[PDB]
Curated annotation (Swiss-Prot), chain C:
Lineage top rank: taxon: Eukaryota
Family matches, as InterPro entries: TFIIA_a-hlx, TFIIA_b-brl, TFIIA_gsu, TFIIA_gsu_C, TFIIA_gsu_N
Family matches, as Pfam families: TFIIA_gamma_C (PF02751), TFIIA_gamma_N (PF02268)
Subunit description: TFIIA is a heterodimer composed of the large TOA1 and a small TOA2 subunits. Interacts with TBP. Interacts with TAF11. Interacts with KAP122.
Alphabetical UniProt keywords: Cytoplasm, Nucleus, Phosphoprotein, Transcription, Transcription regulation
UniProt function note: TFIIA is a component of the transcription machinery of RNA polymerase II and plays an important role in transcriptional activation. TFIIA in a complex with TBP mediates transcriptional activity.
Remaining remarks: Present with 3910 molecules/cell in log phase SD medium.
Segments forming a coiled coil: none
Protein name (Swiss-Prot/TrEMBL): Transcription initiation factor IIA subunit 2
Lineage of the species this protein comes from: Eukaryota, Fungi, Dikarya, Ascomycota, Saccharomycotina
Family membership noted in the UniProt record: Belongs to the TFIIA subunit 2 family.
Curated annotation (Swiss-Prot), chain D:
Protein name: DNA-directed RNA polymerase II subunit RPB2
Function: DNA-dependent RNA polymerase catalyzes the transcription of DNA into RNA using the four ribonucleoside triphosphates as substrates. Second largest component of RNA polymerases II which synthesizes mRNA precursors and many functional non-coding RNAs. Proposed to contribute to the polymerase catalytic activity and forms the polymerase active center together with the largest subunit. Pol II is the central component of the basal RNA polymerase II transcription machinery.
TM regions (residue ranges): none
Taxon lineage: Eukaryota, Fungi, Dikarya, Ascomycota, Saccharomycotina
Disulphide-bonded residues: none
Curated annotation (Swiss-Prot), chain E:
Gene: SPT15
Biological source species: Saccharomyces cerevisiae (strain ATCC 204508 / S288c)
Name listed for the protein in its UniProt record: TATA-box-binding protein
Principal subcellular localisation of the protein: nucleus
UniProt keyword Repeat, yes or no: yes
Paired cysteines (S-S): none
Family: Belongs to the TBP family.
Curated annotation (Swiss-Prot), chain G:
Species in which this protein is naturally found: Saccharomyces cerevisiae (strain ATCC 204508 / S288c) (Baker's yeast)
Lineage: Eukaryota, Fungi, Dikarya, Ascomycota, Saccharomycotina
Misc. comment: Present with 520 molecules/cell in log phase SD medium.
Location in the cell: Nucleus
Annotated function: TFIIF is a general transcription initiation factor that binds to RNA polymerase II. Its functions include the recruitment of RNA polymerase II to the promoter bound DNA-TBP-TFIIB complex, decreasing the affinity of RNA polymerase II for non-specific DNA, allowing for the subsequent recruitment of TFIIE and TFIIH, and facilitating RNA polymerase II elongation.
This protein's name: Transcription initiation factor IIF subunit beta
Length: 138, 43, 100, 126, 180, 92, 101
């Protein structure tokens, strides 16, 4: 918990899954502890960052990354499923942006590598494809 | 058991980085590392 | 080991009736009758385990259900039963004992 | 001298003592064992705070108060015994032990292969 | 506005006043389940009002699944009668509603991140862990689950007015954070 | 109507009799008494009850599903024997 | 020789740090009281040493309940090869007394 906090407060981002890879917290128990800690901090008184980090894992060009950033902001405004957690949106946003460009990752490789269910990426892709009209930076 | 916890990278990494920063091999040796002299290309 | 539920089956009742007769009608050693039934319990179990192929499908209204002491009791009404043919039954009683 | 150390010494040091076994007792006794294989060296890289990772050319390396280094990977094969009976998980791992500083112009650094105008793009005076 | 929350589940407790033999209870009831190894209570059910009861050896009983307070007391009395009919010296006492759940639809999408930022001390929102925002209201002390779709869940109430009170209090806030 | 049933029934009678013979001989009763048991049992043999084992029982709302195994049923005066059975029933 | 990995270097680092990928390999993943007590006592004459585990396996009761009654009949030895096992100190009369109570 304290780690994930310091990540947040540091403007860095780490996924619940990632920390979950460093430590086995059982999940739900973790959420409750994190919330109580958050409450204590208030008493003592943002997906976007994830997008470049993922490119790293894929080693994608800069233009791809910034394209993905525009894509994330545009997708969040257009609403429609509200995101179903940010992680799915960040990965799908990428998958779109890359498929725009010629650079193959195909699908299963990104689903494995980034640990997103292939069905999830394709499902996100259909709805995202529908709004292809307004997501185009130039 | 999880590999990331078992292997600690800063042991080696920060170890070497430290040593070359201080230049002390241990003291058992000291001053082995020295900042380069750019006074003149000869120097 | 071996549940005694199969004694309530057509083949089980028949056995009971036969033995009861040998005991009463004759002078055939009772207690041995029990020994026989103990054998029955085991045989029906292995036979139904190793000598069956059929797969049944029962679909209908659940009139009543119940659980106590590792036994599930169901009473299905207006159901269609499929063998591997389609049969219909107004009222079917099911009694099931834990496989584990 | 540094190049010889990179090509040969890392492989030999890891190879000489790699094997370590755990002795497990039960009442049946048991072993666990981990070996170190062919080591792997990278090209020089940088980990930024956010976690974006990218190649490092020395110029920038100076300006940003960085350390010019490449990562090191090791092949870890893990085994389990039960007692010489052998089960275990293998292949599939390539493990990051730590970073190794890299001497400029050596075979590992990016500049050693550069040409004149090439160097000029990177702004390292030939 | 015009929207009033719909009650979805009422949980109540009843003291029967006498010890019970659970195998006996499970055996004699028409709609009972009892596996000591899984949970220490007979799970009994009745068709009208459609509810489920958790019956303990101490004679205490939890009744859940009702959609109205009337239905809760009704079904509770019914379960007590069943226990009596089976033969125990049970009494219908201490009927008390412990939890009321309600829900409604405001008919517009909500900006959860904005709401969480604005009402930070009462809010908890981790969309990767659970998609809804958990809002912990002070007065009345009710917990609300707020979703992007505009569907709202209110829980933790002991009285119906608290469900109604909380929604009235939250509506202006949901409006302030609408999407269209 | 089922043939597998009659076959199973036959296996049961034959199998039980031969096993029971030891005890029968021990009790010094009579081989022909054993034969009588066999003939009477088979004679008797010539109400919609299923006896079996359960692997799993589940429920979601008022929908119940059951994975039954190794059983015997009498449906409308006919007998069936099965390896597996699936029950899909809706409670109210 | 030693082989230099030539990749975009991003993939290698992603695998290094927290990758959102876990597991994929495994290494060191690591009768009523009357008849119950009477039966357990017959075991005590049958075994001068036994365990709450052996008793709980027999009686299918929590070890805590088994530990209470055993304190009355049996005593514990915590030292030696038989350590953490209860040793004893008519059996039919005790069984009939258990049946009465």
């Amino acid at each position: 918990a304290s780690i994930l906090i310091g990540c947040r407060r540091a403007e860095v981002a780490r996924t619940f899954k990632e920390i979950q890879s460093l430590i086995h917290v059982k999940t739900k128990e973790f959420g409750k502890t994190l919330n109580i800690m958050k409450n204590i901090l208030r008493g003592k008184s943002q997906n976007l960052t994830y997008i470049p980090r993922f490119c790293s894992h894929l080693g994608l060009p800069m233009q791809v990354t910034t394209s993905a950033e525009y894509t994330a902001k545009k997708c969040k405004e257009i609403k429609e499923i509200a995101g179903k957690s940010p992680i799915t949106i960040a990965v799908v946003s990428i998958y779109l942006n890359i498929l725009l460009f010629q650079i193959p990752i195909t699908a299963a490789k990104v689903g494995q590598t980034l640990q997103v269910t292939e069905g999830t990426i394709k499902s996100g892709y259909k709805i995202l494809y529908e709004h292809r009209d307004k997501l185009v930076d130039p | 058991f999880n590999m990331k916890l078992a292997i600690n990278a800063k042991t080696i990494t920060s170890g070497l980085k430290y040593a070359l920063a201080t230049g002390n091999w241990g003291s058992s040796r000291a001053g082995v590392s020295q900042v380069l002299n750019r006074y003149t290309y000869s120097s | 080991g071996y549940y005694e539920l199969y004694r309530r089956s057509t083949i089980g009742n028949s056995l009971v009736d036969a033995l009861d007769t040998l005991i009463s009608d004759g002078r055939i050693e009772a207690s041995l009758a029990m020994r026989v039934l103990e054998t029955f319990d085991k045989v029906v179990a292995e036979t139904l385990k190793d000598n069956t192929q059929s797969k049944l499908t029962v679909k209908g209204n659940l009139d009543t259900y119940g659980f106590c002491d590792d036994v599930w009791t169901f009473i299905v009404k207006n159901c269609q039963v499929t063998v591997e043919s389609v049969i219909s039954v107004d009222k079917l009683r099911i009694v099931a004992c834990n496989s584990k | 001298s540094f190049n010889q150390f990179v090509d040969y010494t890392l492989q030999d040091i890891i190879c000489e003592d790699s094997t370590l076994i755990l002795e497990q007792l039960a009442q049946i006794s048991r072993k666990y064992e981990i070996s170190f294989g062919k080591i792997y060296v990278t090209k020089p890289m940088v980990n930024e705070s956010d976690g974006v990772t990218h190649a490092l050319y020395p110029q920038e390396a100076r300006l940003r108060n960085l350390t010019y280094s490449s990562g090191l990977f090791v092949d870890v094969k893990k085994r389990t015994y039960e007692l010489k009976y052998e089960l275990a998980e293998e292949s599939e791992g390539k493990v990051f032990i730590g970073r190794l500083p890299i001497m400029l112009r050596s075979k590992n650094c990016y500049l050693s292969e550069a040409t004149e105008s090439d160097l000029y793009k990177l702004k390292e005076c030939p | 506005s015009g929207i009033v929350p719909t009650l979805q589940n009422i949980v109540a407790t009843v003291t029967l006043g006498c010890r019970l033999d659970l195998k006996t209870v499970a055996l004699h009831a028409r709609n009972a389940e009892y596996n000591p190894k899984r949970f220490a209570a007979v799970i009994m059910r009745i068709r009208e009002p459609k509810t489920t009861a958790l019956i303990f050896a101490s004679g205490k009983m939890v009744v859940t699944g009702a959609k109205s307070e009337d239905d809760s007391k009704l079904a509770s009395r019914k379960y007590a009668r069943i226990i009596q009919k089976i033969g125990f010296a049970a009494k219908f006492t201490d009927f008390k509603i412990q939890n009321i759940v309600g829900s409604c639809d405001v008919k517009f999408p909500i900006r959860l991140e904005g709401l969480a930022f604005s009402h930070g001390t009462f809010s908890s929102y981790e969309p990767e862990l659970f998609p809804g925002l958990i809002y912990r209201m002070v007065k009345p002390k009710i917990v609300l689950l707020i979703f992007v779709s505009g569907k709202i869940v209110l829980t933790g109430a002991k009285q119906r007015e608290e469900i109604y009170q909380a929604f009235e209090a939250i509506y202006p806030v949901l409006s302030e954070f609408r999407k269209m | 109507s089922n043939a597998e049933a009659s076959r199973v029934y036959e296996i049961i009678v034959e199998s039980v009799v031969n096993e029971v013979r030891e005890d029968f001989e021990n009790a010094g009763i009579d081989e022909q008494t054993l034969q009588d048991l066999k003939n009477i049992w088979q004679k008797k043999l010539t109400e919609n009850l299923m006896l079996c084992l359960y692997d799993k029982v589940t429920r979601t709302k008022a929908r119940w599903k059951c994975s039954l195994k190794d059983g015997v049923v009498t449906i409308n005066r006919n007998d069936y024997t099965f390896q597996k059975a699936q029950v899909e029933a809706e409670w109210v | 020789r030693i082989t230099t990995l030539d990749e975009t270097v991003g993939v290698t680092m992603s695998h290094t740090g927290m990758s959102m990928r876990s597991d994929n390999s495994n290494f060191l993943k690591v009768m009523p009281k009357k008849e119950i007590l009477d039966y357990l006592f017959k075991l005590f004459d049958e075994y001068d040493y036994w365990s709450l585990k052996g008793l709980k396996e027999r009686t299918r009761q929590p070890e805590a309940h088994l530990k209470e009654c055993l304190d009355k009949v049996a005593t514990l030895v915590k030292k030696g090869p038989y350590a953490f096992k209860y040793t004893l100190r008519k059996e039919e009369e005790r069984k009939a007394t258990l049946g009465e109570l």
